[PDB]
């Protein structure tokens, strides 16, 4: 393994159009039994499909290493974004090179048991 390794969580959501499962690797934080997941970049012309899927069906699966969790996903509240965003930037310093508005558009999703 190289200095370039970036831990990711595989988030599986239910496709909003077909109901088929869809997987996306995302950046994440653990907080007790919560897993916080976020897109790796922002300011997109479109929200990512995994985020639109979990808006329609909050029931998701998160895999970290070989551990599989069934969780229910919801947007971080304003307070939770303020709480988690600095820990995300610490864990993934590539976020530092984004401007303000870019950051405010990143989905930050709390998945809980």
Swiss-Prot record:
Reactions catalysed, as given in the entry? oxidized coenzyme F420-(gamma-L-Glu)(n) + a quinol + H(+) = reduced coenzyme F420-(gamma-L-Glu)(n) + a quinone
Q: Name one GO molecular function term.
A: oxidoreductase activity
Statement: the UniProt record of this protein carries the keyword Ribonucleoprotein: no
Q: Which GO terms describe its cellular component?
A: plasma membrane
EC annotation? 1.-.-.-, 1.1.98.-
* Record's subcellular location: Cell membrane
The residues the record assigns to binding coenzyme F420-(gamma-Glu)n are 16-18, 22-27, 38-41, 49-53, 95
Question: Mind listing the UniProt keywords for this protein, alphabetically?
Answer: Cell membrane, Membrane, Oxidoreductase
What's the protein's topology in the membrane? Peripheral membrane protein
**Role:** Involved in a F420-dependent anti-oxidant mechanism that protects M.tuberculosis against oxidative stress and bactericidal agents. Catalyzes the F420H(2)-dependent two-electron reduction of quinones to dihydroquinones, thereby preventing the formation of cytotoxic semiquinones obtained by the one-electron reduction pathway. Is involved in the bioreductive activation of bicyclic 4-nitroimidazole prodrugs such as PA-824 and delamanid developed for anti-tuberculosis therapy against both replicating and persistent bacteria. Ddn uses the reduced F420 produced by FGD1 to activate PA-824.
Q: Which family does it belong to?
A: Belongs to the F420H(2)-dependent quinone reductase family.
Q: What is this protein called?
A: Deazaflavin-dependent nitroreductase
Q: Which residues of the full protein are shown?
A: 39 to 151 of 151
